[PDB]
């Protein structure tokens, strides 16, 4: 849900720029224990309502793993790197799933974000980071959930350059 990001430091907002046309994204997440989760998403603006359409194909998750055993404890906060490739915006991230016994299971997200707007109408951002926090509440077992997310797009201010780079 990439429309909801706070941008700092004069970084152009690829997603908000994409309206009214909207955008798509496509991702494969590769899990360290062999699972794959692939998704395609369409984002459109319908009046005063954003509309998401998602397609999912997941496979090879180990039967004994935290995913198939339904014993996962949510995600740690994450950091995504984003930069231009082939005139579109690519995203790369590692995430860590909380597991029983204070353990983590890691995975890698390979994303391409595609504006439905022509290149001529878009300001492409420079290399930058997006900090994400996703928090989930299971309201009814396997049936009803609530999800909260916070996201910020930024440069690396925490570790400063000595060449005056971002």
């Amino acid at each position: 849900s990439k429309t909801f990001i706070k941008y700092v430091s004069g970084i152009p907002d690829y997603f908000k720029q994409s309206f009214p046309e909207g955008f798509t994204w496509e991702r494969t997440t590769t899990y360290e224990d062999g699972g794959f989760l692939t998704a395609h998403q369409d984002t459109s603006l319908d009046g005063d309502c954003l509309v998401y359409k998602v397609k999912i194909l997941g496979n090879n998750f180990p039967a004994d793993g935290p995913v198939m055993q339904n014993k996962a404890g949510g995600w740690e906060p994450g950091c995504e790197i984003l930069y231009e490739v082939d005139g579109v915006l690519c995203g790369q991230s590692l995430m860590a799933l909380k597991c029983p016994g204070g353990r983590h299971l890691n995975c890698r997200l390979h994303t391409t974000y595609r504006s439905k707007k022509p290149a001529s109408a878009l300001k492409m951002p420079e290399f930058h980071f997006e900090d994400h926090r996703i928090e989930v509440k299971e309201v009814q077992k396997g049936k009803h959930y609530e999800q909260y997310e916070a996201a910020v797009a930024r440069y690396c201010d925490a570790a400063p350059s000595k060449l005056g780079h971002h």
């Binding site: 997440t29 999912i56 194909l57 995600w75 396997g142 999800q147 997310e149």
Partner: protein, 58 residues
């Protein structure tokens, strides 16, 4: 955009042979980068796998 924006979602998928469908409703602050939503499994529930694998798609 407006400083509070609603959204709705439909999701369909298959994970490890299990077919499912979800709907979602939420709202957030687009410029402040915060959002909240409800997700309901409307087909293939109760989900026989961790919902966490769907979070980044919702």
């Amino acid at each position: 955009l407006t400083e509070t924006m609603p959204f709705r979602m439909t999701m369909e998928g298959t994970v490890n042979g299990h077919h499912f469908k979800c709907t979602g409703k939420g709202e957030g602050n687009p410029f402040e980068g915060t959002q909240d939503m409800k997700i309901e499994v409307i087909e293939g529930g109760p989900l026989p796998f961790a919902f966490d694998i769907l979070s980044t798609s919702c």
